[PDB]
Chains A and B, each alone.
Chain A
């Protein structure tokens, strides 16, 4: 891990802030309605696949793209709270003359983010599964070589996985995943060897919605991985029972045979 080598390698400071975003009024309304919808009720009854519901809920929390509502065109920032937070953060950071690395588990949401960054004066470079493979490494190199490109939209599936992105400084994980490893590698794109500048990681999450329950899932997973990779004395994940009640809206507010036998007795005493 990067703790037994940090003093011997001299990486910069890293941060892992989390922001519990608050769902906007229209966003709240669509979410509150869809949880109350008959479809969710049927999924709770197990009549069909749960995946459909989970997709729908994640979409709602991600933007009201279930239903689209001049200056209220599709993918409007003010319509969804997380986009408001992203606006504020990118505003302050662009004023800081700093390079940002914005990740999203989805690909079409990466498009809504793209049109947003058009709506702003933020010069970006987007990179997902549809961008050509041959244009991939040159795109990464381009973004890393010059500071003109400010933000770098990324889908986590190609955005993770071995690319080096030391050019960016600030990383924001816009959308959680069921897989902790996805966001972990995403945030770890920056904080690598050659990152000569401080980097902070912002996880944008919707309080009380599906995304918090997915967060609980990926925490429980992470603890399970820790229990077997870093040390087995992990603390029990006491926060949740992890059931199928994740459809709710609850917004805020030589060993000499005695060493052996001793070791054996130790293990079998537990």
Chain B
């Protein structure tokens, strides 16, 4: 490394090199920090975590018990050891607490003043962070498996919601219009994700093994259906063009938004070109999931090489996105792992699990 410092200092390399390379080096060194803890507040498993996109200071966390906890990730104490204390919490006594498991929780991109959370009580509630009161409640006729607000839309403020119904609901937070539906799936929608590149592209994955990308502006159905083989097994599309051979319970666009990673219960992950949904044939090997609900996984950002961190049973498996090489499997949870979220500032990973723990993985040295 001192070579890296000397290269930065002399302008041999752009300073971008040392960031990105050092960021990567940090990611490869992720290790369970016992020099950092997250305060236990969930009585039930953590289904979801979300670090705020601006300033990355606060994390939301949704539990199987229905509570939403709001954690502060900055070490405000002077010690080197700290516990990420829980700022607020939608507890059992809140009048608005969810009744059943919170399945997704998301900071409003663009501003930390409002977050949204959806549950198995069939509601997507929008919250004022400051007063911690709901500002809006959308009711759905079927249990919500995931939602997602666009990380990029300065223009629209749609929330895509996937329920057990076969239809994707778009909920407009600007005047509250929960009527719009995308129709074309056939079984529950286990994962939705807006594109980080394009304002109005949404990808939705369903238990029917199909993943569709939609231009929600468009009035004409899906843009693309991802097909495992790219056409080697080609049929008039009524049942073919499955992304997976099981349920597809996870989606994640890569950072720059040029590829889509889907995980499904055939124990595979695939990487897809998000422009024409073609399959890049990245291998990745066998990725165990048997989650019956959405599997929340992330990608890294701002490294030399992009990584994807996928819950693999009771561990987080780290893979290199574009080559498939499994970097490592981070082993520190006790029960299955439900969600991992990446802190892009410091290359830290937080992962929740059914054992009611949120473990921080920070680079060593």
Give the docked Cα–Cα distance between A264 and B175 (Å): 7
CB distance from B182 to the nearest CB of A (A): 23
A72 to B327, CA, bound (A): 103
Query: Which listed segment binds B: A118-126, A192-200, A254-262?
Result: A254-262
Q: Which one, A260, A267, A268, contacts B114 given CB within 8 A? A: A260
CA distance A215 to B174 in the complex (A): 38
Query: Within the assembled complex, what's the spacing in Å between the Cα atoms of A257 and B128?
Result: 8
The closest CB in chain B to the CB of A267 belongs to B176
Contacting residue for A255 out of B126, B128, B174, CB 8 A: B174
C-beta contact mask, A30-67 vs B, less than 8 Å → 1, else 0? 00000000000000000000000000000000000000
Which residues does chain A contribute within 8 Å of B154, judged by CB atoms?
A: 254
**A263 touching B174 in the complex, CB below 8 Å, given contacts A254-B154, A255-B157:** yes
Secondary structure type dominating chain A contacts: helix
- A260: chain B residues at CB < 8 Å are 108, 114, 135, 157, 173-174
The verdict on A227 contacting chain B, using a C-beta distance below 8 Å, is: no
Tell me whether B113 is interfacial, beta carbon within 8 Å: yes
Judge whether B135 and A256 touch: CB under 8 Å: no
Cα-based distance from A255 to B126 in the complex (angstroms): 15
Question: Is B111 part of the contact surface with A, judged by Cβ < 8 Å?
Answer: yes
B113 and A261 contact, CB distance less than 8 A: yes
A58 to B185, CA, bound (A): 51
* Contact present for B157 and A261 (CB under 8 Å): no
User: Could you tell me the distance in whole angstroms from the C-beta of A70 to the nearest C-beta in chain B?
Assistant: 65
* Chain B: minimal CB distance from A120 (Å): 54
**Contact residues in A for B135 (Cβ distance below 8 Å):** 260-261, 264-265, 268
The answer to whether the Cβ of B94 comes within 8 Å of any Cβ in the partner chain is no
- Chain B, residues 153-176, CB within 8 Å of chain A (1/0): the string is 110010000000000000001111
- B-contact 0/1 string along A179-193, CB 8 Å cutoff: 000000000000000
Complexed CA–CA distance, A263 and B135 (Å): 9
Contacts of B112 in A (CB 8 A): 257
Give A260's nearest chain B residue, CB to CB.
B173
Do B173 and A264 touch (CB < 8 A)?
Answer: yes
C-alpha spacing A255/B114, complex, angstroms: 11
B110 beta carbon closer than 8 Å to chain A: yes
By a CB distance below 8 angstroms, the chain A residues around B114 are: 257, 260-261
Nearest-neighbour CB distance to chain A for B341, whole angstroms, equals: 21
CA distance A264 to B138 in the complex (A): 11
Interface residues of A in 241-270 (CB under 8 A from B): 254-258, 260-261, 263-265, 267-268
Q: Shortest beta-carbon distance, B158 to chain A, in Å?
A: 12
Q: Is A254 in contact with B175, judged by CB distance below 8 angstroms?
A: no
Bound complex: CA of A255 vs CA of B154, how far in Å? 7
Q: How many B residues are at the interface, by size bracket?
A: 10 to 19
By the criterion CB–CB under 8 Å, are B174 and A257 in contact?
A: no
Q: In the complex, which residues of chain A have a beta carbon less than 8 angstroms from the beta carbon of B110?
A: 254-257
Inter-subunit contact B128/A261 (CB<8 Å): yes
Chain A residues near B108 (CB-CB < 8 A): 257, 260
- Residue-wise, chain B 103-140 has the 8 Å CB interface mask toward A (1 for contact) of 00000101111100000000000101000000110000
B111 touches A256 (CB 8 A): yes
With a cutoff of 8 Å between Cβ atoms, the chain B residues found around residue A268 in the complex are 135-136
Give the residues in chain B near A261, CB-CB below 8 Å. Answer: 113-114, 126, 128, 135
**Cα distance A263–B113 when bound, in Å?**
14
**A264: which of B111, B113, B176 is its contact (CB, 8 Å)?**
B176
Interface contact B136-A254, CB-CB below 8 Å: no
- Whole-angstrom distance from the CB of A158 to the nearest CB of chain B? 32
Chain A residues whose C-beta falls within 8 Å of the C-beta of B128 in the assembled complex: 261
Residues of B within 8 A of A255 (CB): 110, 157, 174
Residue of B nearest to A262 (CB): B135
Q: In the complex, are the beta carbons of A258 and B176 less than 8 A apart?
A: no
- For residue B50, give the distance in angstroms from its CB to the closest CB of chain A: 15
Taking the closest CB of chain A, its distance from the CB of B138, in whole angstroms, is 11
A254–B149 CA distance with the chains assembled, in angstroms: 13
Tell me, rounded to whole Å, the shortest Cβ–Cβ distance linking B21 to chain A. 33
Most interface-central of A255, A256, A261, A267 (chain B CB within 10 A): A261
B175 in contact with A263 (CB, 8 Å): yes
Residues A257 and B111 in contact in the complex (CB < 8 Å), given A264-B126, A268-B135: yes
In residues 9-43 of chain B, which contact A (Cβ within 8 Å)? none
Least distance between A198 CB and chain B CB atoms (Å): 41
Docked complex Cα distance between A265 and B112 (Å)? 18
Q: How far is the CB of A114 from chain B (nearest CB, A)?
A: 47
- Distance from A267 Cβ to chain B, minimum over Cβ atoms (Å): 6
Flag if B111 contacts A254 (CB, 8 Å): yes
Q: Determine the distance from Cα of A187 to Cα of B136 in the docked complex, in whole angstroms.
A: 45
Q: Measured between alpha carbons, how far is A256 from B110 in the docked complex, in Å?
A: 7
Annotate A118-156 by CB proximity to B: 1 below 8 A, 0 otherwise: 000000000000000000000000000000000000000
CB-defined contacts of A263 to chain B, threshold 8 Å: 174-175
Instruction: Please give the distance in Å from B129's CB to the nearest CB on chain A.
Output: 8
Query: Shortest CB–CB separation between residue B127 and chain A, in angstroms?
Result: 9
Bound-complex Cα distance A250 to B63 (A): 68
The answer to whether A258 and B174 touch across the interface, beta carbons within 8 angstroms, is no
Q: A264-B135, A268-B135, A268-B136 are in contact. Are A258 and B175 (CB under 8 A)?
A: no
Residue positions of A touching B, CB distance < 8 A: 254-258, 260-261, 263-265, 267-268
Return 27 A-B CB contacts under 8 Å, by A number. A254-B111, A254-B153, A254-B154, A255-B110, A255-B157, A256-B110, A257-B108, A257-B111, A257-B112, A257-B114, A260-B114, A260-B157, A260-B173, A260-B174, A261-B113, A261-B114, A261-B126, A261-B128, A261-B135, A263-B175, A264-B135, A264-B136, A264-B176, A267-B136, A267-B176, A268-B135, A268-B136
- The interface of chain B, by Cβ under 8 A from chain A, is 108, 110-114, 126, 128, 135-136, 153-154, 157, 173-176
Give 9 new A-B contacts, CB below 8 A, not counting A257-B113, A264-B135: A256-B111, A257-B108, A260-B108, A260-B135, A260-B173, A263-B174, A263-B175, A264-B136, A267-B176
